[PDB]
Amino acid sequence: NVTGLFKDCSKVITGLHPTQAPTHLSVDTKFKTEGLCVDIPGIPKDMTYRRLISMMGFKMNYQVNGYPNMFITREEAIRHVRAWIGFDVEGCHATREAVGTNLPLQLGFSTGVNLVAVPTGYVDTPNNTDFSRVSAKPPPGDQFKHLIPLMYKGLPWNVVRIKIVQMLSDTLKNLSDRVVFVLWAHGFELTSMKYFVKIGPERTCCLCDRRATCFSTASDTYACWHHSIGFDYVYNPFMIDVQQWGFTGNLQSNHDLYCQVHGNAHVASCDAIMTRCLAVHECFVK
Amino acid sequence: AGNATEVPANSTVLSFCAFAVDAAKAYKDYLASGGQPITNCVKMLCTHTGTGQAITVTPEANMDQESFGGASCCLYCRCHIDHPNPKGFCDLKGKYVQIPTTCANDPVGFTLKNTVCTVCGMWKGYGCSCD
Ligand SMILES: NC(=O)c1sccc1-c1ccccc1
Numbered sequence: 365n366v367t368g369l370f371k372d373c374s375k376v377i378t379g380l381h382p383t384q385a386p387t388h389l390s391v392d393t394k395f396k397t398e399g400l401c402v403d404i405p406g407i408p409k410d411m412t413y414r415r416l417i418s419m420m421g422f423k424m425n426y427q428v429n430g431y432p433n434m435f436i437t438r439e440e441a442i443r444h445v446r447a448w449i450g451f452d453v454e455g456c457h458a459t460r461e462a463v464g465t466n467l468p469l470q471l472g473f474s475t476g477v478n479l480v481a482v483p484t485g486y487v488d489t490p491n492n493t494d495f496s497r498v499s500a501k502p503p504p505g506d507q508f509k510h511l512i513p514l515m516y517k518g519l520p521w522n523v524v525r526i527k528i529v530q531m532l533s534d535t536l537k538n539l540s541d542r543v544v545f546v547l548w549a550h551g552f553e554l555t556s557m558k559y560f561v562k563i564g565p566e567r568t569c570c571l572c573d574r575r576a577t578c579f580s581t582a583s584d585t586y587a588c589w590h591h592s593i594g595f596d597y598v599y600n601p602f603m604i605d606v607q608q609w610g611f612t613g614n615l616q617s618n619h620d621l622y623c624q625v626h627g628n629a630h631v632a633s634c635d636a637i638m639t640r641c642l643a644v645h646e647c648f649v650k
Numbered sequence: 651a652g653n654a655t656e657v658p659a660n661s662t663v664l665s666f667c668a669f670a671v672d673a674a675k676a677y678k679d680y681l682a683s684g685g686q687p688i689t690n691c692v693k694m695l696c697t698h699t700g701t702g703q704a705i706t707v708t709p710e711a712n713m714d715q716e717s718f719g720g721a722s723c724c725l726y727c728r729c730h731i732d733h734p735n736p737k738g739f740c741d742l743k744g745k746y747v748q749i750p751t752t753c754a755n756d757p758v759g760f761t762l763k764n765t766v767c768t769v770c771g772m773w774k775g776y777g778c779s780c781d
Pocket residue numbers: 372376377378379380389390391392393394653654655
């Protein structure tokens with residue numbers, strides 16, 4: 365029994381040395397014996413590797429005292445409809461030095477905003493995990509043709525996450541004390557959140573009594589939507605997967621049952637707009 | 651495509667600590683709420699006649715210890731997140747780490763909570779002969 369979470373996507377034909385392998389599974393077969401691992405005199409550590417680690421397969425199903433749930437019920441989501449922001453991500457595939465994982469490329473929101481990121485991944489090295497630009501290409505097919513010019517229009521993730529916080533803050537400061545990301549098939553959206561979301565116990569803003577919705581790695585401080593200028597991370601967001609409500613087919617067919625004013629213009633923000641619109645019609649119309 | 655590094659019993663704790671502001675505190679709080687320690691570590695077969703020093707080039711467990719691969723006992727290596735060092739490099743990856751047998755059920759938790767004496771090279775409160 366294995367998981368896809370933290371799958372090693374490198375093309376290296378062997379496993380790792382016992383001192384460098386993050387897990388028993390990743391240690392090379394040559395060191396395995398009698399149920400455990402052995403150090404072999406004369407067999408050295410690898411000092412120049414770059415192994416892309418997949419961030420697909422997160423499971424936010426923990427129950428830890430004082431830490432809120434990220435995924436909320438339909439009833440809780442309905443009470444916080446003013447915090448609803450549809451979210452969708454179009455990915456690009458790892459290529460050349462790695463294969464087997466999706467990297468965020470176009471991040472779309474129900475506000476009409478699309479942000480383009482440089483293809484970036486988590487690369488294990490002999491010393492640390494290097495969060496860096498990796499070789500990538502858009503998926504093949506006429507439906508993903510629009511993603512080709514985006515491969516050279518991306519911004520570094522340190523700039524993208526600041527822009528996400530600024531956009532959420534401007535949109536939500538006079539609407540809600542939180543954000544509820546409205547998702548359709550959450551897997552890849554939760555993987556993208558790893559790039560711009562931090563979690564922890566419920567905190568209060570550094571300048572007021574409101575709950576913290578943002579975090580800054582510059583000062584290790586917390587802020588609400590009113591005081592988050594310059595902040596780089598979304599702190600303790602909430603989210604819901606609309607697909608889990610009983611729908612069978614794709615997003616567009618389900619959205620089209622209630623709405624005709626949102627024609628699919630084939631872009632991440634349109635999928636995010638359709639997702640929020642479908643959830644609003646399902647919960648508040650007729 | 652690719653090769654799996656992890657087992658499903660670790661998915662929840664690694665996901666929790668991969669997103670936390672403070673990963674070390676998240677791991678400690680996860681255990682305090684009834685969660686299982688991180689498993690699938692690199693445990694070594696050795697002669698248990700080693701020096702007993704905390705961090706070494708080869709396995710050096712004495713009779714009170716177990717030897718483990720360094721990266722496998724590091725929460726930051728396990729979650730693929732930033733190391734709290736100034737230069738962001740790891741002191742465990744590329745080395746073997748000796749853990750008291752009484753703490754060998756949770757080697758990641760042990761390295762998080764414990765300190766190596768810089769003078770004798772042993773864990774404080776688990777072998778240090780300085781004071
Ligand atoms: N025996 C092994 O560990 C082998 S053989 C070729 C690849 C691997 C590997 C690499 C990373 C993670 C898990 C497995």
